[PDB]
Design a protein around this ligand. Sequence first.
Ligand code: BCL
Ligand code: BCL
Ligand code: BCL
Ligand code: BCL
Ligand code: BPH
Ligand code: BPH
Ligand code: SPN
Ligand code: CL
Ligand code: FE
Lengths: 301, 281, 235
Amino acid sequence: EYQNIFSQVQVRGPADLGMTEDVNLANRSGVGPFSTLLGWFGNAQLGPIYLGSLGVLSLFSGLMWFFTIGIWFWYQAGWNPAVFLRDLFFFSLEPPAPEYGLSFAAPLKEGGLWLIASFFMFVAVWSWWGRTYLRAQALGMGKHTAWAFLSAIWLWMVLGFIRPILMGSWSEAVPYGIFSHLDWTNNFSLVHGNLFYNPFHGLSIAFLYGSALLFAMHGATILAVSRFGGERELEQIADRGTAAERWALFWRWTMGFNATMEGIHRWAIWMAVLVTLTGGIGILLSGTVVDNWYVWGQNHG
Amino acid sequence: ALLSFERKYRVPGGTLVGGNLFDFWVGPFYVGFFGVATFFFAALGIILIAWSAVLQGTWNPQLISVYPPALEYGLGGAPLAKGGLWQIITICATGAFVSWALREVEICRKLGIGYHIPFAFAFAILAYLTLVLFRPVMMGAWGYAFPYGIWTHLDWVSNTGYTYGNFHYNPAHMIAISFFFTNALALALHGALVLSAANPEKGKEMRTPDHEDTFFRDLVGYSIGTLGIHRLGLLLSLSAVFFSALCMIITGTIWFDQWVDWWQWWVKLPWWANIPGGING
Amino acid sequence: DLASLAIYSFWIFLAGLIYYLQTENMREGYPLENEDGTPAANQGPFPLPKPKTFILPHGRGTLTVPGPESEDRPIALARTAVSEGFPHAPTGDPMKDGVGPASWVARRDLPELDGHGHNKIKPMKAAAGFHVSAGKNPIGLPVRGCDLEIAGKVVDIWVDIPEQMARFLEVELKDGSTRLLPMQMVKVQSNRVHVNALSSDLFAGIPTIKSPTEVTLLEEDKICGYVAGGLMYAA
Ligand code: BCL
Ligand code: BCL
Ligand code: BCL
Ligand code: BCL
Ligand SMILES: CC[C@H]1c2cc3[nH]c4c(c3C)C(=O)[C@H](C(=O)OC)c4c3nc(cc4[nH]c(cc(n2)[C@@H]1C)c(C(C)=O)c4C)[C@@H](C)[C@@H]3CCC(=O)OC/C=C(\C)CCC[C@H](C)CCC[C@H](C)CCCC(C)C
Ligand SMILES: CC[C@H]1c2cc3[nH]c4c(c3C)C(=O)[C@H](C(=O)OC)c4c3nc(cc4[nH]c(cc(n2)[C@@H]1C)c(C(C)=O)c4C)[C@@H](C)[C@@H]3CCC(=O)OC/C=C(\C)CCC[C@H](C)CCC[C@H](C)CCCC(C)C
Ligand SMILES: COC(C)(C)C(=O)C/C=C(\C)CC/C=C(\C)CC/C=C(\C)CCCC/C(C)=C/CCC(C)CC/C=C(\C)CCC=C(C)C
Ligand SMILES: [Cl-]
Ligand SMILES: [Fe+3]
């Protein structure tokens, strides 16, 4: 009758400053405020973030990338806030022309800025990745988040760095712009014989769709058994409870096979990770090895 | 045939139709009236698809395709050869899916759990029904619906998109896509977080959901928590699909020109429409 | 061709992924059993995985799963047919007997511990500095069951300290004792709490807790099991 999508009653205690383990506490901030708004759905505590040196690097980097595109956009607007807001989605920081290959000789206005921005992003994301690892280590947890995040990084690395290098030009890489980076995507598929014929693209789709199927299933089913404490997945892993049993059996009786409270999360981490993994291969091969997926598909090979 | 703990749950009751008539299992599968219903619809569907295949003249699964009635038939019926089989197969498909959902409700009742799963499924069924039933009806022919064939259905998606230019510019579709990507991000993280607490560094003891909250706060400055993440997944998922249905129900109907051009509402807004410079002046 | 090898390799990869994943999901509930508890003939095409051991925190031992599976419990049910696949009738009161949607698991009879080794769930009384922060505060509200009769009064919220979340409402019945009702099975309203699962007369039958200021995993399971079962068994 009551569905547990939003909480009926929030409670608040003293700010939870977290588990210590080996974490260097001098680099945790204070707690942030509490948001009753968030608290209807998730937790209300915004609070402590860890900002060490690798964190500060990433944050500085990320902002420089973003501001580098920013002043280009403002400059494209002729320094006018009305024009800037008006054409926000049409502005684009485009990579250097094919003329300049993989060099850094292109002028700032005609590629140089793209690379500066790109440099700043590269350092942003990798430093953020290492951070993903280091936070796990300080708490003595597994490295799954880092390894899963690498699969995202793969697609991104293949889009702006690996593929451009292999194809001999930076001009091949994705421009920074809302509408412009959409055009790039459509232009990529057209120029490579329609990516619907790339077997990896289609596999990427199966996994992206599959991630919606699975998290729909999983969120729905864990809420279904939340009346037996089902969201307490770790303890249900260590001491199976009627929540885990009824949950397994929903699926056993429905589709005839089923998971464990731990094992479903393995299905999760993989369904997702395989989206960008298969995807990144699909792009890497495109133009390096296969010029046209219609044609390749006519022979498979 | 049973999991080590299953017997205590295989009690009578929970059915919506038929009382105890169909209240039983076959292997791991629960049956019920809607087990019998989906089986029937699914089997009629496959027999019709199989028979449609013989009339197309093929048996290769990468060539079988049951095309909807050509646009000339409008919203009426077609000969089996040339539209009818799709229409009937669609009737069977909806039968099979809706039955599958109602069967899931029955399993839920018997198991004493919440109805969240079939509710979630209902969204997928609605997506399907938008493409095969609601949109074609507003448009005025079954021919606008997609055909049932591995690659022919991908041909349809491509031709339907490019009717409206680069379909990327459909704004409902933009929101759709964002939910899809965000959902898959959220799935990766959830999967990996729980696994990283259940499977700590070699020799160390299982961590605790406090560690999970701690980890994420350390990292991004916030943690949604273990109830939240399950609500989030369900909401990102259903939202993706909600917007998928929307972005198609409006295409062909309220908006039918090139989607890129729809964005001129913003740029022509009177207070900045005519200011020089920028991309648009 | 390089792509044609890439895709071929991947299908083999994915095949072994699925194998790994499906065997991983056999660490519980297996080896399959017949309805009489003996081991089924046909266990599927996948073998049981090599065991893994979880080190449990706070000196609570390990868990090694796939392991000897048992209910550690009498199951009050009897066959209703002379062959596989039919339902199994409760032999007494399924609510009292913990069967069906009233089922519970014989989980460990200690409370779940937080990351500091303190009881995860506490009554708000003992929960230092914890107060209701948004929404209607149910404490003081009469509790009504599906028979539109008053079953008792709410006397506290039992809260999850780490996750800062309501988990039960402690309700006081006519005789002065208390039961816990899970948050997920009550509807808080401006002037009552409504429990649709149980009729007012089934509240006394809710499983009680050994100590009034903690609840154990075994006990959460009996309570939640009992209250869920009412949806089927009160009606
Ligand atoms: C995958 C193949 C194409 C591609 C195809 C598409 C298509 C098709 C669409 C998008 C859409 C999006 N893409 Mg793209 N996208 C690609 C690679 C990228 C990369 C990258 C670093 O590689 C980034 C950052 C983005 C960013 C984005 C977002 C603007 C938007 C929603 C993403 C989302 O839900 O994220 C995950 C969710 C998160 C919460 C992470 C953070 C989200 C924020 C909003 C990221 C945006 C940062 C950006 C700099 C801020 C905007 C600038 C302001 C206007 C000032 N794309 C590649 C090249 N992308 C959708 C859109 O709405 O476009 C208008 C869309 O329809
Ligand atoms: C959603 C928007 C478009 C569409 C766009 C795309 C695009 C784009 C792609 C696909 C792809 C696929 N689509 Mg499609 N697809 C649509 C509607 C459908 C419907 C439907 C009943 O409405 C079905 C059954 C499918 C089925 C499929 C699969 C054949 C393939 C992988 C999907 C997947 O993993 O999903 C997630 C689900 C799971 C992981 C669960 C398992 C799903 C199984 C595998 C479905 C099998 C279907 C079976 C072969 C046919 C029916 C069996 C009958 C009994 C005869 N599509 C609509 C019209 N689809 C991809 C492909 O590679 O095609 C070649 C691809 O690139
Ligand atoms: C007309 C266009 C073409 C087409 C062109 C392309 C191209 C080109 C590409 C895809 C790609 C994809 N397409 Mg396609 N695609 C088409 C039709 C479809 C259809 C469909 C129903 O028709 C579907 C469902 C898809 C689906 C997909 C996905 C499966 C895949 C992207 C996965 C992903 O998560 O990327 C998003 C994930 C990323 C971009 C990784 C980002 C990770 C980085 C590290 C994040 C950095 C964040 C940054 C720092 C900003 C932070 C901001 C704030 C701090 C938060 N395509 C048509 C046929 N598609 C991609 C792919 O893999 O193809 C094989 C790709 O390159
Ligand atoms: C050239 C083509 C155009 C384009 C044209 C279209 C068109 C046209 C459509 C989409 C649709 C979608 N596109 Mg687009 N799209 C493009 C590029 C992209 C890109 C990209 C990265 O560039 C992305 C990420 C997307 C993303 C998406 C999704 C938002 C949406 C598909 C999901 C959906 O509807 O699921 C919904 C899920 C279903 C319909 C399946 C439900 C399953 C049913 C209920 C059960 C079936 C059971 C099965 C038969 C059982 C068999 C298995 C048994 C075990 C045997 N598109 C390009 C530019 N896109 C579609 C959409 O929004 O549809 C509503 C759509 O129609
Ligand atoms: C399995 C593949 C999926 C996946 C997985 C994945 N992503 C991940 C991870 C994982 C496992 C992480 O661990 C990591 C993470 O930290 O998650 C919380 C991450 C991450 N995925 C991200 C994004 C992302 N992932 C995507 C995709 C996917 N990620 C896939 C679907 C996408 C898509 C679909 O496009 C995006 C956009 C990041 C949020 C995060 C990595 C963060 C990072 O690298 O940060 C560098 C630092 C910066 C970029 C700082 C930039 C600042 C902002 C640009 C501006 C903020 C606005 C400001 C308020 C304005 C100020 C201006 C005023 C002065 C006017
Ligand atoms: C709503 C959010 C997401 C979602 C959720 C969701 N799906 C679900 C559920 C939920 C909650 C279930 O409970 C249910 C399930 O059991 O999952 C394991 C299901 C399910 N989602 C499924 C598939 C599926 N879901 C998809 C999508 C999504 N499902 C979303 C992304 C897709 C996509 C993206 O394409 C597919 C392919 C099934 C695995 C399962 C439902 C099984 C079912 O209905 O079985 C009964 C019917 C049959 C067994 C046979 C049907 C025979 C037909 C009569 C003939 C064939 C007609 C068909 C139209 C032709 C197909 C041609 C194609 C080549 C295009
Ligand atoms: C509001 O006004 C101010 C000025 C304050 C602003 O701050 C405004 C700022 C903005 C308006 C910012 C808006 C920015 C965008 C619209 C950004 C959009 C970005 C995308 C859509 C990006 C998509 C994809 C990008 C990809 C795939 C890039 C990948 C890059 C790499 C893998 C890294 C490649 C590195 C290179 C080429 C450099 C290598 C060189 C070496 C020397 C190592
Ligand atoms: Cl699940
Ligand atoms: Fe989970």
